[PDB]
Design a protein around this ligand. Sequence first.
Ligand SMILES: OC[C@@H]1O[C@@H](OC[C@@H]2O[C@@H](OC[C@@H]3O[C@H](O)[C@H](O)[C@H]3O)[C@H](O)[C@H]2O)[C@H](O)[C@H]1O
Ligand SMILES: [Ca+2]
Length: 314
Amino acid sequence: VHFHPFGGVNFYEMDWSLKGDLWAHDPVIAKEGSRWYVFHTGSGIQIKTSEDGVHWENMGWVFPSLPDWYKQYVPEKDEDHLWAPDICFYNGIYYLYYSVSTFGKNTSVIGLATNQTLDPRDPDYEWKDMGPVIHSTASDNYNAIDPNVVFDQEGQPWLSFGSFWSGIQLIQLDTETMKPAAQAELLTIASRGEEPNAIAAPFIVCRNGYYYLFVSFDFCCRGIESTYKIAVGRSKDITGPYVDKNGVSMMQGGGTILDEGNDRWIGPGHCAVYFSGVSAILVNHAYDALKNGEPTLQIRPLYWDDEGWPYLSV
Ligand SMILES: OC[C@@H]1O[C@@H](OC[C@@H]2O[C@@H](OC[C@@H]3O[C@H](O)[C@H](O)[C@H]3O)[C@H](O)[C@H]2O)[C@H](O)[C@H]1O
Ligand SMILES: [Ca+2]
């Protein structure tokens, strides 16, 4: 994946029993040179770095504070937390999308920050505030949070996002601005078909002509009472229709469960999928039943069966 490069590494031959600073919620990963980076929900977007991918250490944050334009979309937040960042590399620039919102509301906005590099040791390092990308108001039937960018095979960039309300959205982005055209159409591509509509954190990857939409089912943010589950569906075309192993549409509650968690790692959710050669990994957070339900970073190798469906190794 050109926008999610990982050099010459085989994820299947790596040790993924993490150590270090592992507190994380809604993580994504990137690798530049010999450094690994994890971005996740928190004050101005939290950052962690690693030399091997096993030992992680906190590495500050993207923004010192919240850009002033946030107030145009979200009531004064005594909170300085930015949610669910997404990272991709395009034309020598790193694009970091993130969310600004208030828990339980859809008065939200997805912003964009760019940088020439992820390494603060490099003089070119500077996270630039490139403003809002797309937003939602209380009157809209979608929620503008949980962004994820994916370039289809044709090299066309797309932004998927959404949490509750009508569900998962999809919209084309322009290659020049990496923001949707003013007239781009917003497409709904997945929904539990229930009320509330507990589906969020979309992440799309293309593998052998198929587009896989990974999403999070049910509830986050409740410690040991979280019920998050990772589900997946696929489509021949990026616009859909995405369907699960049973042929059921993801617009009607369809979705093949990849991980529902257990009594030790509660509600695994908000995943990210990355490739390297034939290997792949699944990244997400899960609540630690042994540590007061604290959100913990998880990275596991992700395999694929002969029928083309993903599955985490035992
Ligand atoms: O930091 C994690 C963050 O939260 C995830 O979604 C949780 C929030 O609740 C969602 O809506 C819950 C309820 O459903 C109805 O629509 C009610 O009106 C509403 O309160 C919101 O979309 C989220 O703010 C996100 O996936 C993740 O970014
Ligand atoms: Ca995400």
